[PDB]
Enzyme design. Structure first.
Site, PDB file in Angstrom:
ATOM      1  CB  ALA A   1      -2.183  -4.774   0.836  1.00 29.91           C
ATOM      2  N   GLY A   2      -4.735  -2.797   0.205  1.00 27.53           N
ATOM      3  CA  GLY A   2      -5.024  -1.362   0.179  1.00 27.53           C
ATOM      4  C   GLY A   2      -5.666  -1.075   1.558  1.00 27.53           C
ATOM      5  CD  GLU A   3      -8.509   3.857   0.492  1.00 25.43           C
ATOM      6  OE1 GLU A   3      -8.243   4.913   1.492  1.00 25.43           O
ATOM      7  OE2 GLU A   3      -9.049   4.009  -0.224  1.00 25.43           O
ATOM      8  CG  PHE A   4     -11.196   0.633   2.788  1.00 25.23           C
ATOM      9  CD1 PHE A   4     -11.553   1.168   3.955  1.00 25.23           C
ATOM     10  CD2 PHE A   4     -11.218   1.219   1.533  1.00 25.23           C
ATOM     11  CE1 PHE A   4     -11.841   2.597   3.821  1.00 25.23           C
ATOM     12  CE2 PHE A   4     -11.556   2.609   1.312  1.00 25.23           C
ATOM     13  CZ  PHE A   4     -11.967   3.210   2.568  1.00 25.23           C
ATOM     14  N   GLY A   5      -8.206  -3.493   3.351  1.00 27.73           N
ATOM     15  CA  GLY A   5      -8.074  -4.728   3.508  1.00 27.73           C
ATOM     16  C   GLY A   5      -7.618  -5.327   2.150  1.00 27.73           C
TER      17      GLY A   5
ATOM     18  NE  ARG B   1      -1.035   7.104  -5.093  1.00 30.83           N
ATOM     19  CZ  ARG B   1      -1.622   8.053  -5.401  1.00 30.83           C
ATOM     20  NH1 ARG B   1      -0.649   9.103  -6.195  1.00 30.83           N
ATOM     21  NH2 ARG B   1      -2.085   8.795  -4.654  1.00 30.83           N
ATOM     22  CG  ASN B   2      -4.650   6.844  -7.738  1.00 34.04           C
ATOM     23  OD1 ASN B   2      -4.262   5.671  -6.954  1.00 34.04           O
ATOM     24  ND2 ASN B   2      -4.397   7.995  -7.143  1.00 34.04           N
TER      25      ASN B   2
ATOM     26  CG  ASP C   1      -7.381   5.523  -5.457  1.00 33.16           C
ATOM     27  OD1 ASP C   1      -7.204   4.628  -4.756  1.00 33.16           O
ATOM     28  OD2 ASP C   1      -7.351   6.659  -4.814  1.00 33.16           O
TER      29      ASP C   1
ATOM     30  CB  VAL D   1      -6.953  -5.849  -3.584  1.00 34.37           C
ATOM     31  CG1 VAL D   1      -7.510  -5.582  -5.039  1.00 34.37           C
ATOM     32  CG2 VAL D   1      -7.078  -4.286  -2.614  1.00 34.37           C
TER      33      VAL D   1
ATOM     34  CG  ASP E   1      -5.004  10.477  -5.102  1.00 34.39           C
ATOM     35  OD1 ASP E   1      -3.841  11.134  -5.026  1.00 34.39           O
ATOM     36  OD2 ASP E   1      -5.280   9.496  -4.537  1.00 34.39           O
TER      37      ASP E   1
END
Lengths: 286, 286
Positions: free
Chosen positions: A36-40, A154-155, A168, A42, A150
């Protein structure tokens, strides 16, 4: 060629038109949820092009305009890059709902989680190779005049062959504000623990501040995904760093590697190596 | 003269040395607490020069370096300005602890709280006079190439003669993230409700986005401190504005004043009036 900030158009479709391929939705099938990401949601799915496995980011219905801008902005950034150690954008679906960003699938997921799952199982040379790959990606970005802001394990994503790729690419990102976060920091936000002192105090983000973050990534890698500064609050982390504290050598880390971490954490940014220096230094070790 | 970002120095003391007067602690006495700020308590007191009443902001012990930078930055910004409708900086105490920012005292406090429940107490002419004062301060700032980014009635102070002055000069403030905020915005951040569409979507802050905010301030004044968009969530506020919704005319508001608000809220920033236009337009209403 050099990086263009998609915000300059004040139309997110511009960078999308310029730097991405439109994909027809009949070519995309989602198979499972992988996050689950910021926009919806995955997904992992398949892209018909021959078919290839892909990661699929979706824009949840009910989005704000700013979210729509930031969503397409991610593609508008990533599509400008073409490098072995930078996540490849296959394309976007912008002309149908829900809109999608389609990128290369990375079987082993995020680097911090991967190294935790595989705690202790690699050779120094394998770990260094992961760091060289990340550094090569960052060298490519710095030469494109792109400052990541960033960079953190994790990215970074990892494929089945242990190749590490910078991921990211956020259009939006701002520094987290929380004075604590003893176990976990924010969402969508740049964590204080990975950010150079001048970027925190003076909002000065340069490729040299990415180098500071890369040093933190080195420490995450050589410790198999330990949390930088353990459970210190962000308040204590910043106080200690400005008093000269630096994270200690990880267990079994070669002195040459820890010394490079320390170079990356020079308080004064002009004294830090550039990503080109880092790639060369790591190449000699390999 | 033009605005200088204190951040360019990478030393918060430089803007202080350049643009402020160092005050000796023996010249400042605190008499009463008048509020809590981001940095510490805020006091009313007296400044020996003769003596004049002052607002006194303190940097509470235990601050982070970023807080010290932001605190001194407020003074480093304010000291560059000299105008009837911009809060005057008397000086700073930087050489001793606790550090202090000393400004002119404003008997009637923040404009939005001052107006609340005073419906009918002022004539349209008096309310317009307040708006003209704010606009004149903003005209001064725009000419100095200073974009405020956080113009709102809560950041305007009122003296005993009802003169309104622009206050709240924060270093590098950021937009709030919060999709909700029906009753309030937690503080510290720039509220979505006061911010122009292009500044939200594209992070494009200009004097013309300050003009959008000024239009919102006009509405706060003519409604005697009503909350813009009432208790709509920020999500619904942004959705409505992008669909063309604009706040309705306040009760008893002359149409020419409402027309001016509506010009300030043109979706395209290039269609908004300039602050120098706004001052002249308001002058001709009085």
């Amino acid at each position: 060629k050099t990086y263009v900030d998609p915000h300059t158009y004040e139309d997110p479709n511009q960078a999308v038109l310029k730097f991405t391929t439109e994909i027809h939705p009949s070519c995309v099938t989602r198979q499972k949820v992988i996050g689950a990401g910021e926009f919806g949601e995955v997904y992992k799915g398949m892209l018909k092009t021959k078919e290839v496995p892909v990661a699929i980011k979706t824009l949840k219905a009910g989005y704000t305009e700013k979210q729509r801008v930031d969503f397409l902005g991610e593609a508008g950034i990533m599509g400008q890059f073409s490098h072995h150690n930078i996540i490849r954008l296959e394309g976007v679906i912008s002309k149908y709902k829900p809109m999608m960003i389609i990128t290369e699938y990375m079987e082993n997921g995020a680097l911090d989680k991967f190294l935790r799952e595989k705690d202790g199982e690699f050779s120094v040379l394998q770990l260094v190779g992961m760091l060289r790959g990340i550094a090569a990606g960052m060298k490519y970005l710095a030469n494109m005049n792109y400052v990541h802001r960033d960079l953190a394990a994790r990215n970074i994503l990892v494929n089945s062959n242990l190749v590490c790729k910078v991921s990211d690419f956020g259009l939006s990102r701002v520094l987290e504000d929380d004075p604590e976060a003893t176990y976990t920091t924010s969402g969508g936000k740049i964590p204080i623990r990975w950010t150079a002192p001048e970027a925190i105090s003076y909002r000065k983000f340069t490729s040299a501040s990415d180098v500071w973050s890369f040093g933190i990534v080195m420490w995450e890698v050589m410790t198999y995904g330990e949390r930088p500064y353990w459970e210190l609050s962000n308040h204590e982390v910043m106080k200690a760093i400005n008093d000269g504290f630096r994270l200690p050598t990880p267990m079994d880390c070669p002195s040459a590697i820890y010394q490079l971490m320390m170079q990356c954490w020079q308080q004064e940014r002009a004294r830090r190596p550039k990503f080109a220096d880092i790639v060369s230094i790591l190449d000699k070790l390999i």
